[PDB]
Amino acid sequence: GCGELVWVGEPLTLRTAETITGKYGVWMRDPKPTYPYTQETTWRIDTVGTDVRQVFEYDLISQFMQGYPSKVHILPRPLESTGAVVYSGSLYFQGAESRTVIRYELNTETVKAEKEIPGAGYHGQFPYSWGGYTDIDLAVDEAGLWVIYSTDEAKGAIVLSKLNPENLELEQTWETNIRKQSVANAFIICGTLYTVSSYTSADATVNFAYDTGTGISKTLTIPFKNRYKYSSMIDYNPLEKKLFAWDNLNMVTYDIKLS
Ligand SMILES: [Ca+2]
Ligand code: NA
């Protein structure tokens, strides 16, 4: 079941974007799929530019890997950066030039909730180390939906909060001692936040852990390879128990092992 991260496998490339619009992006599957979607449904957002609204949806993995989308959704408001997730039928994304998270229900194309993440920096205040306006990073783990951010009161250290997926209320918050701008990205596995040291290196590491159950911080040295030298997005999927990442045009996955 659950445990501490102990190993990350080699990146596997599933699709490569063919234009610069996909240099950065987010791709994802739903770890709690709901009708009409399934555990194979995949979403892809190419996130370069200033008016990002198109969300590509694929019914089957084979379509994601080789074909055109099954459907394209046009979001009612432009999206910011690479932090979005899908969870239990909704895309959760940050509005451009805002600290607002939006719940967009995919089957009805309806905005169901919006919430300012209180005190969160946005638009280049507390990005990860590559920039990209990556101030606010949503995450799904075994327990549900979270948000990773920082605030002036936390002096740029990573803050994580559990979110109610229905109405986006913050349920509980934890403050780490990890400077968000000093790490390439982060993700949560089994209630532990992990960070990646570098977005360019073939020889990066998963370098810090913060366990929300115990409050304990640790250092780690688990190898992590950025095959294409520019990882813009690194998230965990708790149904597949894999990392999903976006690395310089390439949509990649990594296997992991937990103790
Ligand atoms: Ca992430
Ligand atoms: Na995310």
Numbering used by the authors: 244 to 502
From the paper:
Mutations within the olfactomedin domain of myocilin (OLF) cause a gain-of-function, namely cytotoxic intracellular aggregation, which hastens disease progression. OLF is a 30 kDa, Ca2+-bound 5-bladed β-propeller. β-propellers do not have a canonical hydrophobic core. Instead, the radial arrangement of β-sheets composed of 4-antiparallel strands form a toroid that forms a molecular clasp from the extreme N- and C- terminal β-strands. β-propellers are stabilized by hydrophobic interactions between β-propeller blades that surround a central hydrophilic channel. In OLF, four of the five blades are further stabilized by ligand binding to a dimetal center in the central channel.
Next, we probed motions in OLFWT that could be relevant to aggregation-prone partial unfolding. First, to probe picosecond time scale motions, we solved a 1.27Å crystal structure of OLFWT. The new structure shares overall features with our previously reported ~2.1Å resolution structure (r.m.s.d < 0.3Å) solved from a pseudo-merohedrally twinned crystal, but the newly refined structure has a low B-factor range (10-30 for Cα, average 15) and limited anisotropic translation/libration/screw (TLS) motions. Furthermore, structural refinement using a multiple conformer algorithm is largely consistent with TLS and B-factor analysis, with fewer side chain conformations modeled in the center of the protein than on the surface. Overall, the main motions in the near-atomic resolution crystal structure are seen in alternative side chain conformations and the external strands of blades B, C, and D. The finding that OLFWT remains globally unchanged despite the subtle change in the NMR spectrum is supported by a number of experiments. There are no changes in the unfolding properties of OLFWT incubated at 4 °C for several months, nor are there changes in the crystal structure described above, which was solved from 10 month old crystals. Second, CSP trends among OLFWT, OLFD380A, OLFI499F, and OLFWT incubated with 1 or 2 M urea reveals that the structural features retained across all four proteins are primarily surface-exposed, particularly within blades C and D. These regions coincide with areas of OLFWT found to experience some undulations in the picosecond time scale, but limited exchange at the microsecond time scale. However, unlike these model systems, OLFWT exhibits limited ps-μs scale motions typically associated with access to a well-defined low-lying, partially folded excited state that is prone to aggregation. Bioinformatics analysis and experiments identified two APR sequences within OLF: P1 (G326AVVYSGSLYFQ) located in the two innermost strands of blade B and P3 (V426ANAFIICGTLYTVSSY) comprising the two innermost strands of blade D. A third stretch, P2 (G387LWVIYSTDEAKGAIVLSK) within blade C, was predicted to form amyloid but remained soluble when tested experimentally.
